[PDB]
Amino acid sequence: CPLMVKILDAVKGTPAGSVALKVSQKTADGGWTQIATGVTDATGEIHNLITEQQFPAGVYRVEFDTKAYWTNQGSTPFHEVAEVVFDAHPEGHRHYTLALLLSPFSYTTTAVVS
Amino acid sequence: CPLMVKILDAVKGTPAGSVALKVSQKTADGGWTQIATGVTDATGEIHNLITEQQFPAGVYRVEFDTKAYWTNQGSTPFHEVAEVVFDAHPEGHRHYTLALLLSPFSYTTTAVVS
Amino acid sequence: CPLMVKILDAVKGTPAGSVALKVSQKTADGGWTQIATGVTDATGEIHNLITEQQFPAGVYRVEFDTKAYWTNQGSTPFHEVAEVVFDAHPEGHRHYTLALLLSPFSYTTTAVVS
Amino acid sequence: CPLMVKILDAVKGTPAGSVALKVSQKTADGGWTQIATGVTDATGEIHNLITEQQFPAGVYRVEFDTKAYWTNQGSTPFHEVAEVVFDAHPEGHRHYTLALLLSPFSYTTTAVVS
Ligand SMILES: O=C(O)C(F)(F)C(F)(F)C(F)(F)C(F)(F)C(F)(F)C(F)(F)C(F)(F)F
Ligand SMILES: O=C(O)C(F)(F)C(F)(F)C(F)(F)C(F)(F)C(F)(F)C(F)(F)C(F)(F)F
């Protein structure tokens, strides 16, 4: 799997379970094609989110539904979503991990690329 | 002015000057209308980005062109853009400051709401 | 004043008021001399923390009592304290601002150096 | 192993290899007892850093030598070290992971506690 996510909760000190997200690929005319969706497990991950055939070179957007996560926790969130947009160059089985650290009014995101 | 930004550079310890951004409001059908553009000054700020008349409650997006910023700093960036998407509740002259801390492969964003 | 702080609360989207801190300079033998204390105001700042006369070049530590802050907010914290330790090069009226973004199990710290 | 670390590099988008650190336990009179040291591998980790017998309930400090890491990379760092101080309650094989995201003038740290 060339695309992994890891989400943590900065209020409780746990991975962020049950976060919904969607992966889209940018189209020529500027639109977006949905290619996968999922919900993180209790470790804040989605295993085998997409396949290598689904992940050609191009621009991708991963949209994380952080608002619902905080609503469930009882907190009042600021953001509607966390968005991560990047150009993928997957040749050579290059792998992408998107890490995300959530607070109700803040998030930190980083990427680890092999 | 109800919407401010403050952008900092985590590599060199200075505000991020000359960062372009676009502000959009979400429409009822789920699309986006651009309502303003600007470029940060050398303090990492944009004064008078929008007016209170342009800022009813709703969903807003600020798109920061961080890729062009890192290219101009001379460091290869990961993100194609940094998008901050948030719910506005201006009732009562509430002001919003979007703070953004930039590194080539990471950013932290938070908000200060008066 | 050559040393400023700005503390924000990532849970509620406001400055962190009433955060106690202690400033120390490192001695030649590797110990620490306390040179100032303060408490943040409701803007998350401490004015006139030290003077230029108290700020030669060297190694400084700012110890932020974040555990007492989170206890008073009513959220269980992870860290016993947040310590920021840095090299000062004041030659030329260089000013230092320590920015600190707090969550119960995380913090982000950066600096803006004039 | 009850204590793990994970260090990432926000400039290059890789784990932070070859970072030296030391683990100390707080003493009654306020001092510190060194209990382990190590250097991260290429995945930004130190496997089996300490044993459960070495990790009684108490306050611990993990000091990461970030200055040397940035000097090696050619960057000019702000901080001397990154310090993480916390009270450990290891009963029930409770585990602690200290995560750390480094930039030359900034770091984010968080903890995951099982
Ligand atoms: O699970 C892991 O080992 C991990 F992916 F490396 C990570 F620990 F989650 C992490 F990416 F390092 C991290 F914790 F998320 C972080 F340090 F990057 C962070 F916390 F700062 C951020 F905010 F990015 F999530
Ligand atoms: O300039 C200011 O007064 C400010 F907006 F408060 C700020 F200092 F930039 C800040 F927001 F606090 C901050 F520095 F950006 C931060 F601390 F929040 C940060 F650095 F951690 C983050 F990464 F969020 F920008």
Which ligand is closest in space to the CA of residue D84? 1
Indicate the top mutation candidate among A3, A5, A6, A66 to test ligand 1's pocket, ranked by most ligand atoms within 8 A of CB. Answer: A6
In a mutational test of the B interface, the residue from D11, D14, D100, D108 whose CB has the highest number of chain B CBs within 10 Å is D11
Collapsing DSSP to helix, strand or coil, A11 comes out as coil
Backbone angle region of A84, left / alpha / beta, with phi > 0 → left and psi within -120 to 50 → alpha: beta
C6 CA → ligand 2 middle, Å: 7
How many other C-beta atoms are found inside a 10 Å radius of the C-beta of residue C57?
Answer: 11
- Please check whether residue A75 is in contact with residue A69, taking contact to mean a CB–CB distance below 8 angstroms: no
Residue A102: other Cβ atoms inside 10 A: 29
Task: Find out whether C62 and C49 touch, Cβ atoms under 8 Å.
Answer: no
D91: three-class secondary structure by DSSP: helix
Contacts of D31 (CB under 8 A, 6+ apart): none
CA–CA separation, D66 and D43 (whole Å): 16
Tell me which residue of B50, B41, B34 sits closest to B1, measured CA to CA.
B50
The residues with which A86 forms a beta bridge, in sequence order, are A60, B79
- Which one of D80, D106, D113 would you mutate to disrupt binding with C, by most C Cβ within 10 Å of its Cβ? D80
Residue B45 sits at φ, ψ, to 5 deg, of -120, 160
Q: Nearest residue CA, atom 8 of ligand 2?
A: C99
Q: What is d(CA A43, CA D21) in angstroms, rounded to the nearest whole number? A: 26
**Under an 8 A CB cutoff, do B11 and D104 touch?**
yes
d(CA B101, CA D106): 9
Residue-level length of chain B: 114
Contact D62, D90 (CB under 8 A): no
Residues D7 and D41: their CA atoms lie apart, in Å, by: 10
Beta bridge pairs of residue A33: A25
| Amino acid present at C78 | F
The ligand 2 atom at the shortest distance from the C-alpha of residue C108 is: 21
Q: Which of A12, A76, A86 is nearest to A44 (CA)?
A: A12
- Which residue out of A4, A6, A8, A12 would a mutagenesis test of the D interface target, given it has the greatest number of D Cβ atoms within 10 Å? A8
CA separation for the pair A86, B79 (Å, rounded):
5
Tell me which residue of D71, D77, D83 sits closest to D106, measured CA to CA.
Answer: D77
Q: Are the CB atoms for A59 and A27 separated by under 8 Å?
A: no
The rounded distance, in Å, linking the Cα atoms of C11 and B110 is 10
Task: Please report residues of A whose CB lies closer than 8 A to that of D113.
Answer: 13-14
CA distance D72 to D59: 31
Tally DSSP H helices, then E strands, for chain C.
Answer: 1, 8
**Residue C83: is it exposed, middle or buried by C-beta count within 10 angstroms (0-12/13-18/19+)?**
buried
Residues with CB under 6 A from ligand 1: A 6, 8, 99-101, 108, 110; D 6, 8, 99, 101, 108, 110
Q: Dihedral sign for Cα D72, D73, D75, D77, please.
A: negative
Instruction: Give the DSSP H or E segment for D69.
Output: helix D66-73
CA torsion angle for C12, C17, C18, C24 (degrees, to 10)?
Answer: 110
DSSP state of D62: E
Name the residue of C106, C107, C108 to mutate for ligand 1: max ligand atoms within 8 A of Cβ. C106
As a whole number of angstroms, the distance between CA C98 and CA C7 comes to 8
Q: Which of D84, A7, A66 is nearest to C106 (CA)?
A: D84
Smallest CA-to-CA distance from D97 within B34, C55, B107, C105 is with: C105
- What is the Cα–Cα distance from D12 to C111, expressed in whole angstroms? 20
- Residues 6 or more apart whose Cβ sits within 8 Å of residue B11: B73, B75, B103, B104, D11, D75, D103, D104, D105
Residue type, A110: T
Closest CA to B7 of B64, B54, B51, B50: B64
- Residue C102: partners with Cβ closer than 8 Å, 6 or more residues away: C7, C8, C9, C10, C16, C66, C69, C70, C82
Q: Which amino acid is at D90?
A: P
Q: Rounded CA gap, C111 and D105, in Å?
A: 6
Taking an 8 Å cut-off on Cβ atoms, the answer to whether C111 and B13 are in contact is yes
Full strand arrangement of the beta sheet holding B106-113: A14-15, A3-9, A96-103, A106-113, B106-113, B96-103, B3-9, B14-15
Q: Which resolution, in Å, applies to this structure? A: 1.8
What is the nearest CA distance from B7 to chain C, expressed in angstroms? 11
DSSP string of B60-95, one letter each residue: EEEEE-HHHHHHHHT---SEEEEEEEEEE--TTT--
Q: Residue D13 contacts by C-beta under 8 Å, 6 or more apart in sequence?
A: A110, A111, A112, A113, B78, B104, B105
Q: Is the CB of B101 under 6 A from ligand 2?
A: yes
How far apart are the CA of B41 and the nearest CA of chain A, in angstroms? 24
State which of D110, D112, D113, D114 you would mutate to test the pocket of ligand 1, scoring each by most atoms of that ligand within 8 A of its C-beta.
D110
Determine contact, residues A5/A97, Cβ cutoff 8 Å.
Answer: yes
Residues 6+ apart with CB under 8 A from A79: A66, A67, A107, B84, B85, B86, B87
Which H helix or E strand runs over D71?
A: helix D66-73
Residue B108 and residue A106 in contact, taking contact as beta carbons nearer than 8 Å: yes
CA–CA gap between residue A29 and residue A74 (Å, rounded): 40
Task: Please give, rounded to a whole number of angstroms, the shortest distance from the CA of D14 to a CA of chain A.
Answer: 5
Phi first, then psi: give them for residue C104, nearest 5 degrees.
-60, -40
Residue C44 neighbours by CB under 8 Å, 6+ apart: C5, C6, C7, C8, C15, C16, C17, C19
| DSSP letter, residue C71 | H
CA distance B59 to A96: 30
